[PDB]
């Protein structure tokens, strides 16, 4: 979580012990159930946990898409999320292949889903 722009900006500056609310889902719960929202969220954290900078490249590619002043995550449409979940999905696999030096066509499908989900 600390690898996000906003949250680091708040936790670095604040000089007192304090509580701060955020809404992690921005406004995603208009068009998305809590289930799939939590699911995408954990995918956006797992790709930020591992690669970091190269995930943040996937998020911040197009500057035309802007993070609002309220939200954390940049405001996409539904389809842009459907592709970005696939890229953020890809970093976990390419990185896994880099780490254990396993060419990833050697894995069973279950092994892929497990890799993506831990």
Partner 1 sequence: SHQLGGQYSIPQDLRENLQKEAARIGENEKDVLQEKMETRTVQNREDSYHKRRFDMKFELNKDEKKERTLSMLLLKIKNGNTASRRTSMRILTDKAVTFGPEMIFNRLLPILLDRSLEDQERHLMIKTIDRVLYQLGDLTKPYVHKILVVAAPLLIDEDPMVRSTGQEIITNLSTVAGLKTILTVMRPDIENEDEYVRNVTSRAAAVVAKALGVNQLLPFINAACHSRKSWKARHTGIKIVQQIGILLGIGVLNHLTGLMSCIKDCLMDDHVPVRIVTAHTLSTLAENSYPYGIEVFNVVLEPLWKGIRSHRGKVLSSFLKAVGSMIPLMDPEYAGYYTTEAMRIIRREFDSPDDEMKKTILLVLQKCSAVESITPKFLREEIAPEFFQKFWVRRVALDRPLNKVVTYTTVTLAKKLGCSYTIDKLLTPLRDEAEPFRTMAVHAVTRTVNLLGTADLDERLETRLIDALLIAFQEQTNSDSIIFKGFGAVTVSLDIRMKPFLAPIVSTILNHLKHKTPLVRQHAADLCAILIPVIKNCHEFEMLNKLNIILYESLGEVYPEVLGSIINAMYCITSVMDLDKLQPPINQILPTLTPILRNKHRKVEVNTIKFVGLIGKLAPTYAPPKEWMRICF
Partner 2 sequence: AAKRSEQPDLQYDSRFFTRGANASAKRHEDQVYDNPLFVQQDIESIYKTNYEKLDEAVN
Partner 3 sequence: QEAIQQNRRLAFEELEGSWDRGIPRISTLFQRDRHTLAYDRGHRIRREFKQYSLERNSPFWWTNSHHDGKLWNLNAYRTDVIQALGGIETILEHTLFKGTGFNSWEGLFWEK
> Which residues of this chain interact with partner 3, rule CB under 8 A?
29-33, 35-36
Binding partner of 108, given partner 2, partner 1, partner 3, none, CB within 5-8 angstroms per partner class: partner 1
Binding partner of 90, given partner 2, partner 1, partner 3, none, CB within 5-8 angstroms per partner class: partner 2
- Closer residue to partner 1 in complex, CB, 7/107: 107
> Is 56:11 a contact under the CB 8 Å cutoff?
no
């Amino acid at each position: 979580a600390m690898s996000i722009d906003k949250l680091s900006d708040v936790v670095m500056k604040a000089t007192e012990p304090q509580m701060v609310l955020f809404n992690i889902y921005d406004d995603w719960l208009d068009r998305i159930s809590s289930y799939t929202a939590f699911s995408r969220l954990t995918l956006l954290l797992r790709a930020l946990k591992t690669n970091e900078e190269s995930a943040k490249m996937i998020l911040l590619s197009d500057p035309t898409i802007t993070i609002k002043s309220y939200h954390l995550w940049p405001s996409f449409t539904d389809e842009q999320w459907i592709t970005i979940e696939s890229q953020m999905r890809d970093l976990i696999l390419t990185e896994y292949g880099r780490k254990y030096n396993v060419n990833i066509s050697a894995l069973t499908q279950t092994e892929i889903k497990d890799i993506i989900l831990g």
